[PDB]
């Protein structure tokens, strides 16, 4: 078939010393477009030509405002006589997320305000490289097999070189997989699975917490690199055992909840004789299983009424679309 | 992004009634740093808390330490109370003698 | 035992105030030895560990001028990031840095560090090679290109390989007794009921330094792992550390269980069993 996609974008001001100075900047701009394979104040214009396939990106964004997704975007000088720009795009809840790199044949007029090669209204350009994840943030269950999506397209002429896969989380960052041009170099038992979409999805099996955090599928090609990141959250729902203890004087009701990562714990108590929620909850120090889940005990003290009550120790946690319960009863 | 404090309540020396040793509340690995921490004896704020030093570890999480002169008694119920942006209500963690 | 030095710098933005709070804290082996805090009466770097007092007034002033420079950098950097994310100015936000070097027990440089985080998440970090940058979040990918192409890697790399390691060695010599001291852990096993027919054995290590320690439980001398409860190593408050490991064993099988303690200060790993009475 054949179509055009457009997006409100920003773009960064060329003064490089300042960029080297600090981490970011806030300098405005305007919009970007391209021809596609479907199947008062003024804004700048970028016109880039599709050589290669942009994977699942086209449909994804054709119905993106309709499906109601907020679509960040931002173009940049891959720098600090032709010239080359790079963009980034984020679909939020939907999740597609992508880096595009572009070139201009230059000899032939330029815009005084910004140093951009312009032509019959616009910045004429063409895109020769992409890197997308469809999986921007991922929640897997402990020990399951995670496949972290990463594609990329190369424009014929580009020879791939590496496919590094790094983990950065908390304090540290470590390599995971390193695909050189012809051989693999896994460091954590990960398998990776004529000018068109490729696949670099890393696959992770038997996740253990050390596998949690931020992954950077990094596609170093012949001229330029383009990273894409994938957030791997790991969930371990707890299990919850209410029982009483401590010899019928000081009737200490007590709730063991454990085998759960991450650290957030919500513990709601219920007492009845259909009465509801109650208070006086009290927790215990923070111990952890060997694998790195957590345990704690809410030691609400039991008050029987005159014949008996039911205390319903429940928690909610990240993985639970529902609070896990434990019901026991109690006497005079 | 935000991270809940990991909270341990313990005795410096092993708990024996009489003589001396201190009570420590170790509040670790939380983010952001705005926080409220009290020691409680039977639900009452412990007026003398000798040290509330603030430091921060390698995983970008702040950790502090709330402790004071201590002699353990059966009648009382020492505890540590924490309020934090991640905690919709203050969190109370009871001290165990051998834990 | 290994050794380390870190400098932790933080700026936290405050709605309605122009100046963020900036704090720099220096550590050797996770123990504080200098500190700077802008909210102090008149801010300047301060000596924290007593062995650090042998630095003269010039040192504190030299470090203090570094903090005063960094404070403005963090103010500007926080604001740029506030801009980039289109965030509101009515909230509180945090910008962090940690730099330094890790030394092995043979005093080789093991890793140099230079990394930044915003809101408690890795933003950009210098990799272990001291040549390349890992940008956790796309925002940082712009910066990475800037700091690769500009090749500002060797700048920091040289310092980490040089000054970081030279000053850390200086401190260890000047601070030997407290930084190089080891204390052997004092260990015992306690015995606790759990339920009818089951008990908890809890293995204690008390009073040790440094904090690194490994506690294991063994059955017929086979170290199990699963179903073992452990607690994050904790300060005793007197300069030493504590840790425990507990396991649930059936009533009457207690003597088949062994706790093992591995610690720099011990000349031979410890082996304990629960000893009833006696």
Curated annotation (Swiss-Prot), chain B:
Assembly mode: Heterodimer of an alpha chain and a beta chain. Beta-2-microglobulin is the beta-chain of major histocompatibility complex class I molecules. Polymers of beta 2-microglobulin can be found in tissues from patients on long-term hemodialysis. B2M alone (not in complex with HLA-I) interacts with M.tuberculosis EsxA (ESAT-6) and an EsxA-EsxB (CFP-10) complex; the tripartite complex can be detected in the host endoplasmic reticulum. The B2M-EsxA complex can be detected in patients with pleural tuberculosis and is stable from pH 4.0 to 8.0 and in the presence of 2M NaCl.
SS bonds (residue pairs): 25-80
The UniProt record lists the keyword Lipoprotein: no
Name this polypeptide is given: Beta-2-microglobulin
Localization, UniProt: Secreted; Cell surface
GO MF annotation: an example: structural molecule activity
Coiled-coil segments: none
Stated consequence of mutating residue 59 to P: Increases tendency towards amyloid formation
Consequence the record notes for mutating residue 76 to N: In AMYLD6; reduced stability; in contrast to the wild-type, the mutant aggregates into fibrils with classic amyloid-like properties under physiologic solvent conditions
Family recorded in the similarity comment: Belongs to the beta-2-microglobulin family.
Upper classification of the organism: Eukaryota, Metazoa, Chordata, Craniata, Vertebrata
Domain Ig-like C1-type residue range list: 5-93
UniProt modification remark: Glycation of Ile-1 is observed in long-term hemodialysis patients.
Residues with Pyrrolidone carboxylic acid modification: 2
Keywords recorded for this protein, A-Z: Amyloid, Amyloidosis, Disease variant, Disulfide bond, Glycation, Glycoprotein, Immunity, Immunoglobulin domain, MHC I, Pyrrolidone carboxylic acid, Secreted, Signal
One cellular component (GO) term of this entry: early endosome lumen
Phenotypic consequence of residue 60 to G: Decreases tendency towards amyloid formation
Swiss-Prot record, chain C:
Record GO biological process: antigen processing and presentation of endogenous peptide antigen via MHC class I via ER pathway, TAP-dependent; negative regulation of neuron projection development; positive regulation of T cell mediated cytotoxicity; T cell mediated cytotoxicity
Domain Ig-like C1-type: 185-273
Disulfide topology: 101-164, 203-259
Resulting phenotype, residue 243 to R: In K-less, no effect on ubiquitination
Subunit and interaction comment: Heterodimer of an alpha chain and a beta chain (beta-2-microglobulin). Interacts with murid herpesvirus 4 protein K3 (mK3).
Family per similarity comment: Belongs to the MHC class I family.
Protein name, as recorded: H-2 class I histocompatibility antigen, D-B alpha chain
Gene that this sequence comes from: H2-D1
Segment of the intact protein contained: 25 to 300 of 362
């Amino acid at each position: 078939p054949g179509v055009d996609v457009v997006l409100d974008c920003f773009l960064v001001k060329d003064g490089a010393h300042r960029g080297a100075l600090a981490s970011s900047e806030d300098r405005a701009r305007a919009s970007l477009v391209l021809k596609q394979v479907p199947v008062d104040d003024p804004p700048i214009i970028f016109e880039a030509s599709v050589d290669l396939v942009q994977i699942p990106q086209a449909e994804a964004l054709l119905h993106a405002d309709a499906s109601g997704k907020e679509v960040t975007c931002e173009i940049s000088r891959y720098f600090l006589t032709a010239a080359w720009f790079m963009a980034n795009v984020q679909v939020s809840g939907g999740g597609p997320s992508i880096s595009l790199v572009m070139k201009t044949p230059r000899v032939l007029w330029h815009p005084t305000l910004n140093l951009p090669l312009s032509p019959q209204g616009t910045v004429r350009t063409a895109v020769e490289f992409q890197v997308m994840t469809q999986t921007q943030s991922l929640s897997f269950l402990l020990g399951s097999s995670a496949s972290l999506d990463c594609g990329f397209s190369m424009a014929p002429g580009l020879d791939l070189i590496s496919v590094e896969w790094r983990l950065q989380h908390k304090g540290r960052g470590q390599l995971v997989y390193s695909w050189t041009a012809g051989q693999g170099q896994a460091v954590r038992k990960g398998a990776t699975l004529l000018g068109m979409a490729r696949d670099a999805s890393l696959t992770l099996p038997g996740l253990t917490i050390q596998d949690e955090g931020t992954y950077i599928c990094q596609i170093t090609t012949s001229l330029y690199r383009a990273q894409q990141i994938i957030q791997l959250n790991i969930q371990a729902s707890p299990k919850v055992r209410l029982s009483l203890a401590n010899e019928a004087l000081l009737p200490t009701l007590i709730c063991d909840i454990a085998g759960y990562y991450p650290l957030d714990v919500v513990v709601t108590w219920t007492r009845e004789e259909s009465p509801a929620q109650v208070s006086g909850a009290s927790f215990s120090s923070l111990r952890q299983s060997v694998a790195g889940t957590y345990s704690i005990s809410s030691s609400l003290t039991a008050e029987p009424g005159s014949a008996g009550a039911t205390y319903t120790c429940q928690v909610t946690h990240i993985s639970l679309e529902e609070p896990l319960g434990a019901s026991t009863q109690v006497v005079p | 992004i935000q991270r809940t404090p990991k909270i341990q309540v313990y005795s410096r020396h092993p708990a024996e009634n009489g003589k001396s040793n201190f009570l420590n509340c170790y509040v670790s690995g939380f983010h952001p740093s705005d926080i409220e921490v009290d020691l409680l004896k039977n639900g009452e704020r412990i007026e003398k808390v000798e040290h509330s030093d603030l430091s921060f570890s390698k995983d970008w999480s702040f950790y502090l330490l709330y402790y004071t002169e201590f002699t353990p008694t059966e009648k009382d119920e020492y505890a540590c109370r924490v309020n934090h942006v991640t905690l919709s209500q203050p969190k109370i963690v009871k001290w165990d003698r051998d834990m | 035992g290994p050794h380390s030095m870190r400098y932790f710098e933080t700026a936290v933005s405050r709605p309605g105030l122009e100046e963020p709070r900036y704090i720099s804290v220096g550590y050797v082996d996770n123990k504080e030895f200098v500190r700077f805090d802008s909210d102090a009466e008149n801010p300047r770097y301060e000596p924290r560990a007593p062995w650090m007092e042998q630095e003269g007034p010039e040192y504190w002033e030299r470090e203090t001028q570094k903090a005063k420079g960094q404070e403005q950098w963090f103010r500007v950097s926080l604001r740029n990031l506030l801009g980039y994310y289109n965030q509101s100015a009515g909230g509180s936000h945090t910008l962090q840095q940690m730099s330094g070097c890790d030394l092995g027990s043979d005093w080789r440089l093991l890793r140099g560090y230079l990394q930044f985080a915003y809101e408690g998440r890795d933003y950009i970090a210098l990799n272990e090679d001291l040549k390349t940058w890992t940008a956790a979040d796309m925002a940082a990918q712009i910066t990475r290109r800037k700091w690769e192409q500009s090749g500002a890697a060797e700048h920091y790399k040289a310092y980490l390989e040089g000054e970081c390691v030279e000053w850390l060695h200086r401190y260890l010599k000047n601070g030997n007794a407290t930084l190089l001291r080891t204390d052997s852990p004092k260990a015992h096993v306690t015995h606790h009921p759990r339920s009818k027919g089951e008990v908890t054995l809890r293995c204690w290590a008390l009073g040790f330094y440094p904090a690194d320690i490994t506690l294991t439980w063994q059955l017929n001398g086979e170290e199990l792992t699963q179903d073992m409860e452990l607690v994050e190593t904790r300060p005793a408050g007197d300069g030493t550390f504590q840790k425990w490991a507990s396991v649930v064993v059936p009533l009457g099988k207690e003597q088949n269980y062994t706790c093992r303690v591995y610690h720099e200060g011990l000349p031979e790993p410890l082996t304990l069993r629960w000893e009833p009475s006696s």
